[PDB]
C-alpha cells in the first residue's frame, strides 16, 4: 500500500469582519451607545407588549 497524505488548500469565508461587512450597509456603523440600557428596556418593553 501507499499512504499519500492529502493537504488543506485555503479558506472560503469564516471571518467576523467580512461577516459584518457582507451587507450593503455597515453593521458595525449602525449601532447604539448604551447596550445594557438597551437590553433592560427591551426586556421591559417586550413584557408590556
Amino acid at each position: 500500500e501507499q499512504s499519500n497524505k492529502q493537504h488543506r488548500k485555503a479558506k472560503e469565508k469564516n471571518t467576523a469582519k467580512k461577516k459584518l461587512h457582507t451587507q450593503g450597509h455597515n453593521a458595525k456603523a449602525f449601532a447604539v451607545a448604551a447596550p445594557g440600557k438597551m437590553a433592560r428596556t427591551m426586556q421591559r418593553s417586550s413584557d408590556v407588549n
Binding site: 471571518t15 467576523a16 469582519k17 459584518l20 453593521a27 458595525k28 449601532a31 447604539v32 447596550p35 438597551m38 437590553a39 427591551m42 426586556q43 418593553s45 417586550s46 413584557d47 407588549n49
Partner: protein
C-alpha cells in the same frame, strides 16, 4: 516581540487594534446590535401569552404521564402553535379551550423516566389567575 507594539507613544495603535478585534468577538456583536433577544426562545420577553388550541393526550390510558400533561397552545404575537407542559391532570381539567395561558420556560436540570423531549414551555397562569392558586383552591377561574 509578541506582535503588539510596546512603545510609550503607541496607545493610539493599541486602542484602534483593540476596537477592531472587540467588534470581531461574538457576544460583543450581539450585545451591541441587539440580537440576543432575537435568539431568545420566543423573543425578548420572560413569559409569553398564548391561546389553548387542544388538550392532547386526553385519550391516553395510564394517568399522569407526560403525553397526558401536554397541551397545544398558539402564541399570539406569532400565530405560532407549540406545545406546553401542565403539571397535575387536575390543572389539565382547569385548562380547556380558548383560554389565554401565560407560558414560561421549563428550566429543567435533569430528565425523567417518561418525559417528552423538546417541550420547553410550561403554563403559569390561565385566563388571568395562577394555576397554582387554582390548584391549591385559593382562587377561582373566572369565565
Amino acid at each position: 516581540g509578541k506582535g503588539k507594539p510596546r512603545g510609550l507613544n503607541s496607545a493610539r495603535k493599541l486602542r484602534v487594534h483593540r476596537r477592531n478585534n472587540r467588534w470581531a468577538e461574538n457576544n460583543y456583536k450581539k450585545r451591541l446590535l441587539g440580537t440576543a433577544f432575537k435568539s431568545s426562545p420566543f423573543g425578548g420577553s420572560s413569559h409569553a401569552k398564548g391561546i389553548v388550541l387542544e388538550k392532547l393526550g386526553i385519550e391516553s390510558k395510564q394517568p399522569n404521564s407526560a403525553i397526558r400533561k401536554c397541551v397545544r397552545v398558539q402564541l399570539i404575537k406569532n400565530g405560532k402553535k407549540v406545545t406546553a407542559f401542565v403539571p397535575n391532570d387536575g390543572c389539565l381539567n382547569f385548562v380547556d379551550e380558548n383560554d389565554e395561558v401565560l407560558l414560561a420556560g421549563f428550566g429543567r436540570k435533569g430528565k425523567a423516566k417518561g418525559d417528552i423531549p423538546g417541550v420547553r414551555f410550561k403554563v403559569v397562569k390561565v385566563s388571568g389567575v395562577s394555576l397554582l392558586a387554582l390548584w391549591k383552591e385559593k382562587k377561582e377561574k373566572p369565565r
